[PDB]
């Protein structure tokens, strides 16, 4: 946790950024899959497409931490799969979006919707 008498800290954003990125990234992940037209996407594709296919261009430092955090909340919709030396990801584009942002909401509860 933070220091005593908490005020003007740059972590107050890092709590709500995760909360807006989790549901936003959930709708652009479906677009990133189909933009490349492939059943699995490498870290090289995802690092381009999650910036350009998404309406908002995210930085590559937070990108890695968000892609992995989906599979950490549910390994059932999104799975990180390591190949011989690269890493690919797999997601269901055919899912009902409103289901994911409803069940994953346990982490959005950090700020409370």
Determination technique used: NMR
Residue 113 lies in a domain: no
Measured between alpha carbons, how far is 112 from 93 in angstroms, rounded to an integer?
A: 27
Give the residue from 87, 95, 110, 113 showing the smallest Cα distance to 12: 110
Give the residue from 82, 69, 101, 2 showing the smallest Cα distance to 40: 82
Helices (H), the chain: 11-36, 43-52, 60-73, 97-103, 105-108
Beta carbons within 10 angstroms of residue 49's beta carbon: 19
CATH of the domain at 83: 1.10.10.1420
Residue 15 lies in a domain: yes
Task: Find out whether 42 and 81 touch, Cβ atoms under 8 Å.
Answer: no
């Amino acid at each position: 946790g933070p220091l005593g008498s908490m005020t003007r800290c740059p972590e107050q954003e890092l709590r709500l950024q995760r909360l807006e990125r989790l549901p936003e990234l959930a709708r652009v992940l479906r677009n990133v899959f189909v933009s490349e037209r492939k059943p699995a996407l490498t870290m090289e594709v995802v690092c381009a497409r999650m910036v350009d296919s998404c309406q908002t261009a995210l930085s590559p430092g937070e990108m890695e931490k968000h892609l992995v955090l989906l599979a950490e909340l549910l390994p059932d919709w999104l799975s990180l799969h390591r190949i011989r030396t690269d890493t690919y990801v797999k997601l269901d584009k055919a899912v009902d979006l409103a289901g994911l942002t409803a069940r994953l909401a346990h982490h959005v509860h950090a700020e409370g919707l």
